[PDB]
């Protein structure tokens, strides 16, 4: 393994143990964003050059999917070397340069790190199968039979015949929860635990701001269990958090656990220490419920998942995003016993058609601009830290035929020029082609075309992000659902607890009202506790009538929404 | 159709995918009824026989080469009744139909395999090749070496290993079981009874395995092929068997069978190295890669015929044929950046030639005048492009581009429901490349291609004539005569991008008048002095050698 010493490191931002609670994340693939060297493939230097756009957009942290050395048989989630970037993307030094440049603009970077397994091309595995009594002999999970752990499901049931695969060289079976070319690491071997902690430290020494830890529920296996969410798995996660907070204060760990929210709460750790595992975890059912709330023109699927979500440690934060599937497994989270909408998804033909396929926001919503704004408003005002996916801010489409994941991984559309301005290479050499249809194609949909008009989706999104950044209640406020006469309208207030040396718009309460119906709707709200306050609409700053003792009437167009600052009255 | 045991020697074939040609029912997928509705186009183009890749019921994990039921049409294409409708409509127009039939293996979803694994003591227990170990047949290479760790896979239900030369979801049939041989003969008869004109038999070199061998081309494999030919000969005279053997031509001749009988296995087999050699001949501006491959091809039985096509890869395995010992061009392909970029990917003719119309015409002229029965691939006649990102095979399987309308006129469905999207780029997109746009001008690639087919059809020499390479002063020009005995044709082809002169010794035909076949202009009669022909870069001429009064 390389040592971090022989590379540069990035200059660390000032320590801020709460930064991730206030952050808007931007998931961007290195391969897709910008090709600076005309090989048809996006690269680290290209991403570095585009930091000006990212800063202008106003996001706080980049989230990079895996960019490590890999044969790319499973999208790069099959890792061949944890210490090396895929050569086509650049080198470790290019990553340090990117980190420094990002940090200069106050922008942080996290990346995906797959903890559960490596590619079978990883040298640990080649040594494990060729030299069984060597130091890597027990780095993986080996057996003379395929009978162990029978209660564990096969995740990729239509592709893999078993969770055990017979290796022709070692003549024993090895365990894999994912594809056969992704052998599971043996976490019962303390050398494996130390090796993986050393991986985290390598990137942290370089200066990375954190990781999304992938496939963590599957680390340990035990007979008599379904081999997910085991005590020893959480124990290892506590080691990661301990190392993180002791040696690198102010960094973050995000858990990718595609489970019902009550079940992922455990991944934040012990409530009594304030949380001692992951700082963040994703709330996967939110988008499916929002999607269904709109289809149904009813607030309840949204009201319900929020009400039923258990409280989490003070230190912790949910991550939220506008996708219906986990990118690792392409599964939508559900629960037969605890999801009242369990059987309802299969009854919606749009939902049904896209089962197991990642889709971008605009295509999910049939390019309806009003709905894109509504879903985006919800993403930016509901509790949690939001993740925007690259290209959704201009309304990019997808290309489903490229694959279940690759559908959403086509080049960023910068201009209406050749290759959408992503590359100077010949089109036949692009890693994937840009969208070329009349609706989503780069001749029509690109950054340059949207920069001019204040009314473009890009400019609208950038303004919404700016507004959000100026109001703390969106990031760390309480959540109070207001109910109301009309079931088609979701209304809530978010409040800051307010301690010492504050008082201003930044800490004033906020009121959000969202119409899930396609038709204009009235709603009368009981806001009597805020009698005398003045609702000020956030985008145009117009003062609405002061709140009284009577119900407050707001009227919304189809799929419309309003955000108001609740200003304290003048004495 | 009235029996005509030589029809395949005179045929031009047209490989057309049911899924890609025409969607008549607006589900976004091409279908048999749709293909039937486009037969007038196929007749007008002038081809003689359709070649349909597998259209059987299948989970489509390996492009439909993974068959779930040999007796059933994939439901989205229609049913056996739609297939008979297609057959009758084609025959009415004098067009025949052959199809791919995978003989070596089935999908693991096939009911035979599910019975084999669940009920080992039952009648299907020995329908596949099972073993307690993965040690047998170690000399057989793994075809898909980057994907399959072994030719043996452990089945979790039966708890034994089964053999597969292809992907793990394609278990090999056990041809040492006599019931397997009878079941597969019965598949042949089922489609022949419906009226199909023949089959391309796929993966046949791999039927039998034997210890101490590489498990290809075994004598028992050829013995089973003889059973297939005999069944055809005895029960369905006038039908054809084509072999898909991606091997050096010398090795392929075995698939025509015993020369002493006039051939007792396949009627046809493919000459795979032809396109790679033509491609390199043009890259090097030398006739030699073509001259040599033809000269080194052994004689085949007189009732047999080579099939030829303008592709560098076999569609089953995505491999280009070669031979370390017998191919002088063996190390040369890797030195060509065009060949190197496209390794393991099917590409259409226009993209292979960077859309150079002169070269498209040159390669097509060679395809239509060299010895063998040519196969045209659907869409090449209008210059369609491909979409490589769709997959190594799906690259060339996008919808036929009929018009510049929505979905290229292939379907009325919404674009997001199409099985694959049409080309949409500035060069190959359906807004500029489509049948409708080319129908009008006599100078379109489509009308040029149609005219060349019409010309070829009027000269038996192209189909069954002898082949005499004329040599000549200039190594950049390939000249030859095709002759049958009363019909003699002279073909001259410029492999150089620049204009070239060639002086030919045509003394044997002195007095004859060369008549150029497209404009019918009479050229100077052949004398005792060498005949000078001058060609533009990548040009060609076809001449009928007419007897003097
Ligand atoms: Ca594990
Ligand atoms: Ca076999
Ligand atoms: Cl990437
Ligand atoms: Cl995800
Ligand atoms: Cl999704
Ligand atoms: Cl098909
Ligand atoms: Cl059927
Ligand atoms: Cl082929
Ligand atoms: Cl090809
Ligand atoms: Mg690049
Ligand atoms: Mg159809």
Swiss-Prot record, chain A:
Q: Does the keyword Endoplasmic reticulum apply?
A: no
Q: What is its EC number?
A: 3.2.1.1, 5.4.99.16
Question: What are the entry keywords?
Answer: Calcium, Carbohydrate metabolism, Glycogen biosynthesis, Glycogen metabolism, Glycosidase, Hydrolase, Isomerase, Metal-binding, Polysaccharide degradation
SUPFAM superfamilies reported for this sequence: (Trans)glycosidases, Glycosyl hydrolase domain
Record-linked InterPro entries: Glyco_hydro_13_cat_dom, Glyco_hydro_b, Glycoside_hydrolase_SF, Malt_amylase-like_C, O16G_dom_2, TreS/a-amylase_N
What Gene3D superfamilies does the annotation carry? Answer: Glycosidases, Golgi alpha-mannosidase II, Oligo-1,6-glucosidase, Domain 2
Name the positions where substrate binds: 74, 117, 182, 212, 325-326
Single GO MF descriptor: alpha-amylase activity
Q: What happens when the gene is disrupted?
A: Cells lacking this gene do not accumulate increased amounts of glycogen in the presence of trehalose and show only a small effect in alpha-glucan. Combined inactivation of treS with glgB or glgC completely blocks alpha-glucan production.
Q: Where does Ca(2+) bind?
A: 116, 184, 218-219, 221
Role: Catalyzes the reversible interconversion of maltose and trehalose by transglucosylation. Maltose is the preferred substrate. To a lesser extent, also displays amylase activity, catalyzing the endohydrolysis of (1->4)-alpha-D-glucosidic linkages in glycogen and maltooligosaccharides such as maltoheptaose, to produce maltose which then can be converted to trehalose. TreS plays a key role in the utilization of trehalose for the production of glycogen and alpha-glucan via the TreS-Pep2 branch involved in the biosynthesis of maltose-1-phosphate (M1P).
Q: Miscellaneous notes for this chain?
A: Maltose-1-phosphate (M1P), the building block required for alpha-glucan production, is generated by two alternative routes: the TreS-Pep2 branch and the GlgC-GlgM branch, however it seems that the GlgC-GlgM branch provides most of M1P for the GlgE pathway in M.smegmatis.
**How does it associate, per the subunit comment?**
Homohexamer.
Family that this chain belongs to = Belongs to the glycosyl hydrolase 13 family. TreS subfamily.
According to UniProt, the name of this protein is: Trehalose synthase/amylase TreS
> From what organism does this protein derive?
Mycolicibacterium smegmatis (strain ATCC 700084 / mc(2)155)
UniProtKB/Swiss-Prot annotation, chain B:
Gene3D superfamilies xref list: Glycosidases, Golgi alpha-mannosidase II, Oligo-1,6-glucosidase, Domain 2
Which residues does the record give as substrate binding sites?
62, 105, 170, 200, 313-314
Recorded hits in SMART domains, A to Z, give: Aamy (SM00642)
Entry keyword Iron-sulfur = no
Q: In what way is its activity controlled?
A: The amylase activity is stimulated by addition of Ca(2+), but this cation and other divalent cations inhibit the trehalose synthase activity. In addition, trehalose synthase activity, but not amylase activity, is strongly inhibited, and in a competitive manner, by validoxylamine. On the other hand, amylase, but not trehalose synthase activity, is inhibited by the known transition-state amylase inhibitor, acarbose, suggesting the possibility of two different active sites.
Q: What is its EC number?
A: 3.2.1.1, 5.4.99.16
Q: Which pathway is this protein engaged in?
A: Glycan biosynthesis; glycogen biosynthesis
CDD domains under this entry?
Answer: AmyAc_TreS
Show the active-site residues. Answer: 202 (nucleophile), 244 (proton donor)
**Which residues of this UniProt protein bind Ca(2+)?**
104, 172, 206-207, 209
Phenotype upon loss of function: Cells lacking this gene do not accumulate increased amounts of glycogen in the presence of trehalose and show only a small effect in alpha-glucan. Combined inactivation of treS with glgB or glgC completely blocks alpha-glucan production.
An example Gene Ontology molecular-function term: calcium ion binding
The record's Gene Ontology biological-process terms are:
glycogen biosynthetic process; glycogen metabolic process; maltose metabolic process; polysaccharide catabolic process; trehalose metabolic process
**In terms of pH, how does activity behave?**
Optimum pH is between 6.0-6.2 for the amylase activity and 7.0 for the trehalose synthase activity.
Q: What is catalyzed by this enzyme? A: D-maltose = alpha,alpha-trehalose; Endohydrolysis of (1->4)-alpha-D-glucosidic linkages in polysaccharides containing three or more (1->4)-alpha-linked D-glucose units
**Keywords for the protein's UniProt record, in alphabetical order:** Calcium, Carbohydrate metabolism, Glycogen biosynthesis, Glycogen metabolism, Glycosidase, Hydrolase, Isomerase, Metal-binding, Polysaccharide degradation
Output the InterPro entries linked to this UniProt entry: Glyco_hydro_13_cat_dom (IPR006047), Glyco_hydro_b (IPR013780), Glycoside_hydrolase_SF (IPR017853), Malt_amylase-like_C (IPR032091), O16G_dom_2 (IPR045857), TreS/a-amylase_N (IPR012810)
Q: What does this protein do?
A: Catalyzes the reversible interconversion of maltose and trehalose by transglucosylation. Maltose is the preferred substrate. To a lesser extent, also displays amylase activity, catalyzing the endohydrolysis of (1->4)-alpha-D-glucosidic linkages in glycogen and maltooligosaccharides such as maltoheptaose, to produce maltose which then can be converted to trehalose. TreS plays a key role in the utilization of trehalose for the production of glycogen and alpha-glucan via the TreS-Pep2 branch involved in the biosynthesis of maltose-1-phosphate (M1P).
The record's comment on protein family reads: Belongs to the glycosyl hydrolase 13 family. TreS subfamily.
Quote the subunit structure annotation.
Homohexamer.
Q: What is this protein called?
A: Trehalose synthase/amylase TreS
Organism source for this protein? Mycolicibacterium smegmatis (strain ATCC 700084 / mc(2)155) (Mycobacterium smegmatis)
Chain's gene name: treS
